[PDB]
Design a protein around this nucleic acid. Structure first.
Ligand code: MN
Ligand code: MN
Ligand code: MN
Lengths: 135, 129
DNA sequence: GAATCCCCTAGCTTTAGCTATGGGGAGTATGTCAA
DNA sequence: GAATCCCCTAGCTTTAGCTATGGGGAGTATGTCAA
């Protein structure tokens, strides 16, 4: 992980060659510090199952009590929202079934929002000038 | 500095370096065809709330750096930019219509980019732990 | 082979000509070779 | 105010609880304050 190359390695679906990495962040309802202990270990396991099913590659994932950071490699045609929607939605249903305190003390496990930031190997300014200098 | 945008439910910054080429990689993206291609895409971007950070053509392919709402989808912008530009350019420059079955191909190249490079973003996550 | 060539459906915009984590295929053809 | 709180429809997955370039709102209440 610490020595994982950040150099691009493209992949493709039937019509698109791509490399789309997203930094996704979301928090529990009311920003409660519920992602600890067992809840945390299960959350990551669940999201990993979702990733495998959705052909999404979790490059990095760390939970930190009242929020979670994921760095995912997703097919842009598939849609980062499909991954997020499934990871959050399934993790909610399951974690709330497995951990009664999350079902009784919160109307929902997550909020309706999330933070999404795309990332690449190169910084935005490098790409911008590269495009700018096409001719 | 990164200016994050937001729809009703998502705070975001999704920037993509999009590239596609004319059918048979013909070097038709020049002159008036090139100028119109850029205008049409600008129109589409404004209508689709897509910010076009940078956009340059190079005879047989077009590069676009755009910020697109994740929920909306990058493929929707790409579909609209290619589909519409094909329809309009083919009506405006008859040769694009007579010598090619389509203006574009079914493929494209897409890569994400952020203000911060991957190593820095990994470092932040690592550090906040 | 595939992104790129040929062919297909279904869904949508541009009602033509493009997507879909969409499918099938080969041989100088109505036909490409790489950003 | 908003992403985050409250409220709503409706689309899809997990059939509950998340979305949608989705919409409406205000003030201790079922009720948050930032990664
Ligand atoms: Mn195909
Ligand atoms: Mn809302
Ligand atoms: Mn180029």
């Amino acid at each position: 992980s610490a020595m994982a190359s950040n150099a691009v390695l493209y992949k493709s679906n039937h019509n698109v060659v791509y490399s789309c990495k997203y930094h996704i962040v979301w928090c529990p309802k009311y920003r409660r510090k519920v992602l600890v202990g067992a809840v945390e270990m299960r959350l990551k396991e669940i999201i990993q199952e979702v990733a495998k099913e959705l052909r999404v590659e979790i490059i990095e994932m760390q939970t930190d009590k009242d929020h979670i950071h994921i760095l995912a490699d997703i097919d842009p045609s598939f849609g980062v929202m499909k991954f997020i929607k499934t990871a959050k939605g399934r993790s909610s249903r399951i974690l709330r079934q497995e951990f009664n305190h999350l079902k009784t003390k919160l109307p929902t496990l997550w909020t309706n929002s999330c933070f999404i930031s795309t990332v690449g190997g190169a910084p935005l300014n490098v790409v911008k000038q590269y495009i700018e200098n096409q001719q």
